[PDB]
């Protein structure tokens, strides 16, 4: 695939790695809707609000299957490490008007 998953389960915001590249989620939006990172970088999303959110990449984007991330509760986090250059669109499964992309350069 074009991403690896450090933790299949969400984890606490306080447990996010020191060097972390963070996208906050609040007010029903991804706070950085267009993020540029390098090959090999790990992106971490953190839900800052009570409404559960996830990130969802449809089939063919990060790999052959869809990657439907777990639902993050308030102050939970989820990471993906990107291993190939490209542009990767994602949305929130229950709220598909929430859209973002990671541009890996
Ligand atoms: Cu959401």
Q: Which two tokens stand for residue 96?
A: 């598909």
Q: Tell how far the Cα of 83 is from the centroid of ligand 1, in angstroms.
A: 25
Q: Which fold would CATH assign to domain 1-105?
A: Immunoglobulin-like (2.60.40)
Burial of 69 (0-12, 13-18, 19+ CB in 10 A): buried
Binding residues for Cu cation: 53, 92, 95, 98
DSSP 102: E
- What was the experiment behind these coordinates? X-ray
Question: How many Å lie between the centroid of ligand 1 and the Cα of residue 31?
Answer: 12
> Cα(74)–Cα(48) distance, rounded to whole angstroms?
6
d(CA 22, CA 31): 10
Using the Cα atoms of residue 18, residue 8, residue 77 and residue 37 in order, give the sign of their dihedral: positive
Angle at 51 between CA 28 and CA 46, to 5 degrees: 75
Domain positions in the chain: 1-105
Buried-exposed string 19-46: b where 16+ CB fall within 10 A, e elsewhere: eebbbbbeeebbebeebeeeeebbbbbb
User: Helix, strand, or coil here: 14?
Assistant: helix
Report the alpha-carbon angle 45-51-57, nearest 5.
Answer: 45
Distance from the alpha carbon of residue 82 to the mean position of ligand 1, in angstroms:
21
Residues tagged in the binding site annotation: 53, 92, 95, 98
Give the distance (Å) from ligand 1 centre to CA of residue 55. Answer: 8
Residue ranges with CB less than 5 Å from ion ligand 1: 53, 92, 95, 98
**Which residues on adjacent β-strands are paired with residue 92?**
95
Here the tokens at position 21 are: 């590249």
Spatial distance between the Cα atoms of 72 and 94, rounded to a whole number of angstroms = 12
> Going along 1-105, which residue ranges are E strands?
3-4, 11-12, 21-26, 29-30, 34-37, 42-47, 56-57, 67-68, 76-82, 86-92, 95-104
């Amino acid at each position: 695939d074009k991403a690896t998953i450090p933790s299949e389960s969400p984890f606490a915001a306080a447990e996010v790695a020191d060097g972390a590249i963070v996208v906050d989620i609040a007010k029903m939006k991804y706070e950085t809707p267009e993020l540029h990172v390098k090959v090999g970088d790990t992106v971490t999303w953190i839900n800052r609000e009570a409404m559960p959110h996830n990130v969802h990449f449809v089939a063919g984007v990060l790999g052959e299957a869809a990657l439907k991330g777990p639902m993050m509760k308030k102050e939970q986090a989820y990471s993906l490490t990107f291993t190939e250059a490209g542009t990767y669109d994602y949305h929130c499964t229950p709220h598909p008007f929430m859209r973002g992309k990671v541009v890996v350069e």
